[PDB]
Amino acid sequence: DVYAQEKQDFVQHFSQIVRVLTEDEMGHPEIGDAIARLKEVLEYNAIGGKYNRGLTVVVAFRELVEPRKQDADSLQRAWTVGWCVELLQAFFLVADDIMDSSLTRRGQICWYQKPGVGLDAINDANLLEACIYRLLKLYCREQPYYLNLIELFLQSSYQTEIGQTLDLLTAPQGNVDLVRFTEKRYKSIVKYKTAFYSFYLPIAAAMYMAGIDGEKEHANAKKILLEMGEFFQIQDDYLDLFGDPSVTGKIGTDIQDNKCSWLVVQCLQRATPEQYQILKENYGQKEAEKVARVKALYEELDLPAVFLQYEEDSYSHIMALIEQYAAPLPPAVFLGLARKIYK
Amino acid sequence: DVYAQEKQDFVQHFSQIVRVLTEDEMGHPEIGDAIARLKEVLEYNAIGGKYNRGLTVVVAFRELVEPRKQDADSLQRAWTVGWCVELLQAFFLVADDIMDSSLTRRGQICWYQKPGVGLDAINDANLLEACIYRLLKLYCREQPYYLNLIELFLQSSYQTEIGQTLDLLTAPQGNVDLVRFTEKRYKSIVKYKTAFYSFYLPIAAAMYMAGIDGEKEHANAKKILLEMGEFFQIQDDYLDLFGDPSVTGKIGTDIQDNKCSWLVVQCLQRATPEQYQILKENYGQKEAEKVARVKALYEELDLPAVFLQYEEDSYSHIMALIEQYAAPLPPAVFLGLARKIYK
Ligand SMILES: O=C(O)[C@H]1Cc2ccccc2N1C(=O)OCc1ccccc1
Ligand SMILES: O=C(O)[C@H]1Cc2ccccc2N1C(=O)OCc1ccccc1
Ligand SMILES: O=P(O)(O)C(O)(Cn1ccnc1)P(=O)(O)O
Ligand SMILES: O=P(O)(O)C(O)(Cn1ccnc1)P(=O)(O)O
Numbered sequence A, B: 001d002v003y004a005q006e007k008q009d010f011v012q013h014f015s016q017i018v019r020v021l022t023e024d025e026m027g028h029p030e031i032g033d034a035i036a037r038l039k040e041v042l043e044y045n046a047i048g049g050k051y052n053r054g055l056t057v058v059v060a061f062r063e064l065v066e067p068r069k070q071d072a073d074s075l076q077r078a079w080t081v082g083w084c085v086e087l088l089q090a091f092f093l094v095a096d097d098i099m100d101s102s103l104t105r106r107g108q109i110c111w112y113q114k115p116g117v118g119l120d121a122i123n124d125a126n127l128l129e130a131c132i133y134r135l136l137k138l139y140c141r142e143q144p145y146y147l148n149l150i151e152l153f154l155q156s157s158y159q160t161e162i163g164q165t166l167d168l169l170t171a172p173q174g175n176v177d178l179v180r181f182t183e184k185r186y187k188s189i190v191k192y193k194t195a196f197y198s199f200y201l202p203i204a205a206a207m208y209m210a211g212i213d214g215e216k217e218h219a220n221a222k223k224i225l226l227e228m229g230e231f232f233q234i235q236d237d238y239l240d241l242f243g244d245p246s247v248t249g250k251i252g253t254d255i256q257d258n259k260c261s262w263l264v265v266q267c268l269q270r271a272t273p274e275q276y277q278i279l280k281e282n283y284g285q286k287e288a289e290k291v292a293r294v295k296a297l298y299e300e301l302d303l304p305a306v307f308l309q310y311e312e313d314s315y316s317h318i319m320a321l322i323e324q325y326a327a328p329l330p331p332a333v334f335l336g337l338a339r340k341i342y343k
C-alpha cells in the first residue's frame, strides 16, 4: 500500500513535467503551436491510468536508497524517471491502439480515434518517446546513472518493439491459422511485448538510481519481474474478453484481431476436433455473432475457471521465485508488486 | 566528388550492419521471426536512395580527423554512424509516407502501401529507430563521443518530430485556409522537419567523432547547415510538383495534402484577389482536375522561374555564410555539400 502514500505526490509532479517540457517555446516562439499540441498529447495520453508502472520507480527508490540519501532532489529525479516510464507506455499504447484498431482506453476514446487526430497520432507517439530523453537529461544529466537510464529505456523500447512485431506477425489480419498459436510462441510474445517495460524497466530504473548496477543483481531481479509480466499479460488477455468493461477501461479486440491470446492457446489444447473447427470458422472476424461464438466455446471449456486456477499457481510460483532471487534486495520491493497484480 | 570515392565502401558496409543486428537471434531463437521481419524492413526502407546524408558523415570524418587517426576501426565506426543517419531518416520517412498518404518513394511503392504491411509499418518504423541506438552501442560504446552521438540523434529526432507537428498542424486535412501559409511559419517548419536531421546531424556527428565538441563550433556549423536545409526543403517542395517523376522517385501530394508548400506561400504573395480565390477552391483536394488547376495557376505566376532565381541567390548567400562561419573547419566540408545540392 506504499503506493497510495506516494500516488498523490506523483500525480502532482506531472504539472511540473508538462511545465518543464513546454518551457522550450520560452526561447523558440516559432514552435509554439507544436508545443501546444505536445501538451494536448501529454494530457490526453499520459493522464487517466493507475500509474502503477511509474509509481513502482518511486516506491522501489525509497526502499533501495538509504533514507539519508533521499534528499528533495533525489525524490524529484525519482518522480521524473517514474513519469518517463509512463511516457514510454503512452508512446507504445497510442501506437498499439492504432495497430490493434482499438476503440477505447482508460474509459475514453483512443487518441487516434478522436476527430482531427487520425494517423497524425503516429507522430504524436514519437514525441511522447522523445520526451523521455528530454526529461532524463534536464533532470539526470549530471547523475552517475544517467547513461544507464538512457540505455535502459532504449533497451526496453527495442525489446517491446521486438515483442510487438511477434504479436503482429502471429496475428495476420484476415488470416486465421490456429497452428501458430503455440504456448512457446505465446510466452515469447508476452515476455518481450509486456514483461520488460511493465515490470523490469521500473524496478531496474530505481536500481540504477540506487547505484545498484551489478549484472547479477539485475539478472536476478529480472528473473522475478519477467515471470510476473508473463502472468500479467495472461490476465490482460483474460480480461480482454471476460473483464468488466467498466473496470478495464477498454473494449476487447483480441478475437477480432486474430490475436495469439492466452485464451485461444488454452482453448486449442483443450479442444475436440469438432470444437477446433468451430473456433476456426469464428476467430479473427469482426462479426459480433462470430466473436460471441468463440466466447461461448471458451466458457464451454471452463477457461474462466482454468484462468482462476493458474492465477493461484502463478502466485505461488512467483513467491517461490522471490524467496530464491530477492536477495540482496528487500523482498518488499517484489512483494509490493505481487500484492497489486494478484487479486 | 569525394562522395563517389566513398559510396561503394559505404553501401557494402550495410551487409555487416544487417548481419550485426540479426546477430541478436543468435542467443534468442524465440525472436527469430521478429528478426527476420526487421531484416525485411531494413532492406526495403534503408536501401534504394542516394545515401548522401550518411555519406556526409564519412566524407566529413576523413576531412576532420587527422589521417594518422583514421585507422580501420575509426572508418568502421564512421560507416556505422553514417548508416545510423540513414536509419533515422528511414524511420521518419516510413511514418511520413503514412501520414502524408504518399504512394511511392525511391521509385517503389511506399512500405505501408505494400500488401500485408499496412499500419504495422508504424512498429516497423519504431524498430528502425531502435536500431540506431543498438548500433551506436555495439560500435561506439567505448568511444569518448558515445554519449554525444546518442544525445545528438535523440535531439535531432525530437526536433524533426517537432517539425513534423508544425507540418501537420498547418496542413489540416480537408481544411483549406491559406491564411496560415505565411513565410515565417514556412521557415520554421522546414527548419525543424528537415534542416536539422538532413544537414546538421551528419556534419555534427562527424564533428563529435573528431573530438570537436565546442559549442561555438557547432553553432557556427549549424549556421551554415540550417540555411542549406532551408534551401533543400524548398527545392523538395518545388520538385514535389515540377520535379521529374523518373528522377524524384516519388509522386507529389503537397497540394492534395493541403501542405504549407513553398510554392503555395509564393503563390499567395504574388496573387490577385481573383487568383487567390481560384487557389482556394482547388487546394487540398484529391480531385486530379483541381490539382491540375492549382498547378496551372503556379505556372501562370512564373513560380518555376521564381524558384530558379532563388536557387541562385540562395547559393550565393550560402557561400557568403561559408566564408564567414566555416573556420576553423575546412571549407571543403561545407563546399562538398553545396556542390551536391546545387544544380
Ligand atoms: O497498473 C497496471 O496495469 C499493472 C502493471 C503494473 C506495474 C507495476 C505495479 C503494478 C502494476 N499493475 C497493476 O497493479 O495492475 C492491477 C490491475 C490490473 C488490471 C485491472 C485493474 C488493476
Ligand atoms: O540526397 C539528398 O536527398 C540531399 C540531402 C543531402 C545531405 C547531404 C548531402 C547531400 C544531400 N542531398 C543531395 O545531394 O540531394 C541532391 C538531389 C536532390 C533532389 C534530387 C536528386 C538529387
Ligand atoms: O493486449 P495488448 O498487448 O494489445 C495491451 O496489453 C497493450 N500492450 C502493448 C504491449 N503490451 C501490452 P492492451 O490490451 O492494453 O491493448
Ligand atoms: O515533403 P516532406 O517534408 O513530406 C519530405 O521531404 C520528407 N520529409 C520529412 C521531413 N522532412 C522531409 P518527402 O517529399 O520526401 O515526403
Ligand SMILES: [Mg+2]
Binding pocket: A096, A097, A100, A102
Ligand atoms: Mg492493444
Ligand SMILES: [Mg+2]
Binding pocket: A096, A100, A167
Ligand atoms: Mg497490441
Ligand SMILES: [Mg+2]
Binding pocket: A236, A237, A240
Ligand atoms: Mg490485451
Ligand SMILES: [Mg+2]
Binding pocket: B096, B097, B100, B102
Ligand atoms: Mg512526405
Ligand SMILES: [Mg+2]
Binding pocket: B096, B100, B167
Ligand atoms: Mg511530410
Ligand SMILES: [Mg+2]
Binding pocket: B236, B237, B240
Ligand atoms: Mg516534399
